[PDB]
Symmetry: D2
């Protein structure tokens, strides 16, 4: 289960770079140089890295330090063959963003948020990114009077429309991916789920520029079925990117390595990405636990990839099993894929077999046979066929 | 705090009619006649009632019993002045619906679900309903292999498009309202939140026929901020109807009377409906606890209305208070309502005050003053100004 | 992975017997005869069954019907070799129990609850049960004023002390096991977790007669770590019995078959029961989903046992792996098992290496190596070593 | 609603002192001097303050800096009349504690944790504290193999027994209060609830030295009823201290000011503390949101006290209302307080009215009248009688 660059595994700088500061504790690990992380991830078999502006260029850098940091970065990419498929903006760490970036009550802050974003879109384009992620982690409230949400959605729409105007005017080939989260660090965050982000996108001036970047642990913080929300994003044509990690139910965001947390959900996710043929990056947004030293960091990054590859194998074996294919027909998955009424509405209304003469007790009596199908899935996951 | 019919308070037949059967216990109360409920609710000050088909007409009724049940109903409405603003279909109780109605794997079931729905749209129109609710409580799964969600959304879209075709062909003035729920009675339900239903509506052939019917307790079962999700529905123009009740956090749907559960959320909800000028029904989808006799039923129904009226008064007092209006300006709610960049994109990019010369430390230092604003809200709710 | 009676797998009558009535739907399956369930479970390899009084003897049975039902039951046990290790009382279904059994506000109800319980303890003893389970599913409240919890604990203590007096006066060899649940069907249930039940037991007159019966899905409805709570019960010497099932996070009790739900938790549970040498029944308190026909019932019951046996094998392989044993030492699990200060308090206080001369930066720098250990556990679970 | 020192309101140094660093953002406020906080809280009407060792004395302070910090502190207390009723140890911030203090896998760490604790017990005694709090926020795990919980409880018991030996040998008048939390910052924390801490205390060598310090938001992070868990602590005689704050359901610990979060729970809590006559400190463990400047800090601290006093008034009015007293009798709260069977076991068994002749249908038919009682409580809370 060895990754290669063709598996499209990517990692944020901030993930293996996390120093282990939590709301209750100091850093447990020294800061990593981005060029060290690029080299180490390349050796583990990753395909590329991603970044916040402030991960790569220290906040407040002069134009001469900026160019130096970028030059060193670019030399590490050249030396390793690593790519940069995605980039994003930090609109959450600096105190100026304490009430949000694009929906901060202070208008001057909202203008600054857009300027900081636009500067990094130029850099992302230069480094070859295809996807620009937006996680509005500070957009929201701890109290009901602090935020008018209708006004706040107006401001959010305004920001993303200006960003779409910018990209089209520059002729850039870059699309946006909005990342939902229900809470943390705000009491409640705006566009808290995949469904809310999809809905929002349909009100933008150019909807085709925008999709979603869902994260495993974010949807699970609302107790939601992550493979179901991804299915809906896939159905809408809007899965531009994805963030992979693990989460043990409804609590703070744990950012565990991928395959930890809800292991059956992880299985069904890989089953779906692979059978839909998702072709974007498999990006890990995770944190090596602060218990770990740098050896435990690279072990944790490597287990992300390993668990993806093991679950790919098991899901492929599942779908390829003739016994499973028979069980799928036993459960009428083939009938779910057929139109309900391709005959059309009038034929439906004239069909006595659909109502007047429908035997509802014989239909009610048919078993769905889902438990046998689910134990086949369990046997396949566990390698116990 | 006496309701009148002009407050637009409505109740489902199934709410005061709930016999108290739960997954662990038998009924504790005898079945109510719909005409008794109509009379009793009228005396309490309600404006109207709503129904599932099977609430009003016993499942399997002959065309002659059907007409009898409708005739008696209609006489009670005439005798009381009660209206019927909304109706809906039961696609969840009968065993035939054990795998869903519109997304049941069995195609014959899906055709039957549509026929049963269409029959009751005709009746709803006859009784004057303006809104037709669809809660797909059986659409979903307990296991990952049982349901392909992309196929299932295809089937769901197909069903609602056929219903839109029906209504337009009949020339009916009726709109649809999809009611989300995240789980229960299915392991996971399709379109689990307001955001997922809004998003889904944008893929229908005629989106303007469809809005949402959110329920307090449903969104709270995902730990979500109900007033935030309603704000988003209002922003999209899609709040066609609403279901009011109470819920104590993430557990089974409790259906407590409105104002129980999360009381501050209830306050902020009423604040928002009243200040947005929502004009639809204030419908209660609640269950008098099975501890109660018929006296406790009507006491519980009456407290729904009472708590709405008390919170309306307190929210109105809050917004009218000059001290609050000053606090709102202190917190820059006035600035949230102003465009970020009406000057447009090029002016933004040339504005040195937005970036080059923006003093981010002075901006970071400004307090938001949200805690003083939130304690004013608390003092107003509690009548402690 | 074939069970035999020596695996000590047991099932409630109510589990494979569940007709599929839920708060939103009618039964989907006909009632099973207890003697049919005994025969079917025997053929699948189970060791025994358990019962509520009202599962075996229809509520209101005459003394002559009672004896008939028991006689038929007893013939099926004799014909199959099945045992009855545990029994319990239904104090939740009948409407008289709507406010509880042992903590009902009505004193006459509380006396009736005890009489109904005592009658079934005699029967349990006759059928050979060693453990008497008490799940007070109706003990609790939907509202704060309805229940004084101090008085209610007085009443609960009183009930269990009278039951301990009864058993000792009869000379029975039977112990009690209290089953916690946090909510459902009450808004909140008294003794909501393992910890609350353990604590409560220490105030009874004869604490040694009482232990706990934890259920997987119950603790998970509070978002708690089930193997951690079982460890604590084992540490206290109070794991008298256990209920096995699956649960997908914080929602209604799903009662999924064992191994569904949280699969890694299931792994760590089996690891702990087997390495502590728990020797009681492995009892399944589950419900075949109402999607299923009788074939899906027996498939679901069989997957309970199968998943237990697969996880036993994987956990045994994990602990036996020399590479794992090395990793456990790398992570200092050996040091956790050593006394902190067997040298005693004064030696601790005089030890300059414990404070004055303790190098806290060198200690802070040591990695715990937990991620490598956790990926070994993952590889072992998935059969990917 | 003005507090005075006789209300026994206390605050941690770390609460108004929180600089606003969160897992995603830098500090938004400068560090406060402890002597400034003492002066400011005194002016607001507080009775005293509490501290971690490291709040008062910077970690690594020399014996000469230590004495200086203590001397200045003590002068502020003398100048204001503020007391120090409780103190505690920081065993969570420094990286050495990344795997715990008293249950760290490294034995040398566990010895250091005890030495650091003992040093601050001496200081607490000198400053007059009566209660010593222990929150083991780092005791737990992110993965199943990292922590044997039986060994870990052995180590936890060992630590608290050595601390009990120390206090008794010094002749100190100080008791311990264990503070539960279910998760955060560890994946799962040991003794996750009130019930688990109560149970644990019963295995210590001297149980009478130990009680609990529950926190509102901690129990609510498990979805539990906080007034119910406090009732159980009161029933056991173990409420030594309490931490007051607000929490909006199951997510990260929000630490909102008291009365925010679940307002009805806050009402029922104050009702219970006041009617049980709890006489310990009313301590606020809260964080002014990082949106706030120092003015919003003191406004937030003041609203803690204000909301307590308003809810005290409303709960007192509730219990004093003759209409409520009648409703309480209607709901049979008077009967809950009477023994079930003071007549004893044999009389119970011979009582034909308890079983043979018990009319279970007439008993089942009685309403509990809880909804009318709960609306009286609602009217009283809202000042709408
Ligand atoms: O999820 C988060 O928390 C971030 O890493 C987000 O993906 C990018 O800002
Ligand atoms: O919410 C539910 O559970 C139903 O009352 C729905 O509003 C209509 O079918
Ligand atoms: O858990 C439940 O819900 C019951 O089966 C309990 O174990 C026995 O009454
Ligand atoms: O609750 C926490 O998080 C701490 O303030 C605890 O009360 C004392 O260490
Ligand atoms: Mn992310
Ligand atoms: Mn509803
Ligand atoms: Mn159980
Ligand atoms: Mn605390």
């Amino acid at each position: 289960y060895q990754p290669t660059p063709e598996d499209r595994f990517t990692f944020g700088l901030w993930t293996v770079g996390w120093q282990g500061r939590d709301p209750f504790g100091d850093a447990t690990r020294r800061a990593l140089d981005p060029v060290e992380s690029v080299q180490r991830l390349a050796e583990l078999g990753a395909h590329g890295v991603t970044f916040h502006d402030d991960d790569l260029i220290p906040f407040g850098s002069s134009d001469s330090e900026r160019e130096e940091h970028v030059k060193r970065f670019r030399q590490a990419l050249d030396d390793t063959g690593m790519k940069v498929p995605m980039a994003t903006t930090n609109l959450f760490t600096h105190p100026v963003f304490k009430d949000g970036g694009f929906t901060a009550n202070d208008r001057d802050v909202r203008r600054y948020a857009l300027r900081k974003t636009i500067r990094n879109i130029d850099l992302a384009v230069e480094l070859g990114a295809e996807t620009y992620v937006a996680w509005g982690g500070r957009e929201g409230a701890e109290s009901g009077g602090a935020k008018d949400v209708r006004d706040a959605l107006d401001r959010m729409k305004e920001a993303f429309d200006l960003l779409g105007e910018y990209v089209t005017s520059q002729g850039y080939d870059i699309r946006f991916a909005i990342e939902p989260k229900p809470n943390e660090p705000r009491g409640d965050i705006l566009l808290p789920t995949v469904g809310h982000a999809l809905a929002f996108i349909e009100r933008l001036e150019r909807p085709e520029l925008y999709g979603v970047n869902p994260e495993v642990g974010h949807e699970q913080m609302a107790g939601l079925n992550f493979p179901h929300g991804i299915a809906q994003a896939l159905w809408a044509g809007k899965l531009f990117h994805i963030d992979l990690n693990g989460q043990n139910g409804i609590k703070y965001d744990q950012d565990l390595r991928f395959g930890a947390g809800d292991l059956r959900a992880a299985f069904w996710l890989v089953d779906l990405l692979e059978s839909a043929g998702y072709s974007g990056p498999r990006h890990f947004d995770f944190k090596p636990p602060r218990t770990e030293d740098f050896d435990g960091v690279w072990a944790s990054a490597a287990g992300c990839m390993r668990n993806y590859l093991i679950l790919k194998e098991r899901a492929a074996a599942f779908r390829a099993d003739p016994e499973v294919q028979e069980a799928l027909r036993a459960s009428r998955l083939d009938e779910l894929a057929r139109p309900t009424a391709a005959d059309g509405l009038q034929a439906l209304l004239d069909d006595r077999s659909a109502f007047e003469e429908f035997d509802v007790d014989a239909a009610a009596a048919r078993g769905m046979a889902f438990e046998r199908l689910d134990q086949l899935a369990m046997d396949h996951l566990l390698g116990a066929r």
